[PDB]
């Protein structure tokens, strides 16, 4: 519905993992994030690049046959839009989202229902599976951080659990 799309799908495949996707250059650039996003700016999550997906896949919630790529249950875990923070810079520090991605340094403000705030995706040269680091960007906070995966486990589109999606198709 709104653009540029940000979506995370929770994906019960071989193992449970999250797929993060951001719209750019007409597709959803995608990463698999084994343990999902963290709200804590000290937590580094690893983000393994996966295939580009079509824009309309952002609201796919249902079941892919076991044995296929993407096989298992897919939940639309969070969805919204994002803003590219790297456009908010003095002249000659500005970077479009595509230039950001090409450089291996993406800083965005995610406008989701579960995640809302500044997050970084940083490309690495030597983490296994062409790893990137995915983390909440540092800002003032007092207190411990919610475990968003525990606190908000269900579909942002339908409110269903993973097992309800698997049973219903
Ligand atoms: Mg997958």
Numbering used by the authors: 30 to 198
Text from the published report:
We previously reported that the M. paludicola phosphoesterase (Mpa PE), which is operonic with an NHEJ RNA/DNA primase–polymerase and ligase, is a functional component of the archaeal NHEJ repair apparatus. To understand more about the molecular mechanism of these atypical nucleases, we elucidated the crystal structure of Mpa PE at a resolution of 1.79 Å. A ribbon diagram of the PE protein shows a hydrophobic core formed of a β-barrel super secondary structure, composed of nine anti-parallel strands. The β-barrel is surrounded by four α-helices and a 310 helix, as observed in a prokaryotic PE structure. The exterior of the β-barrel provides a cavity for the active site, which is enclosed by the 310 helix and a surface loop. We predict that this cleft is a DNA binding channel. Analysis of the crystal structure of Mpa PE suggested that the conserved histidine residue (H82) may be one of the key residues in positioning the scissile phosphate in the active site.
The AP–NHEJ repair complex is primarily composed of a Ku homodimer, DNA ligase (Lig), DNA polymerase (Pol) and a phosphoesterase (PE). Studies on NHEJ repair in Mtu and the archaeon Methanocella paludicola (Mpa) demonstrated that both species possess equivalent core AP–NHEJ components, with orthologous proteins possessing near identical substrate specificities. We discovered that Pol has DNA strand displacement activity during RNA synthesis and that PE resects excessive incorporation to promote efficient break ligation.
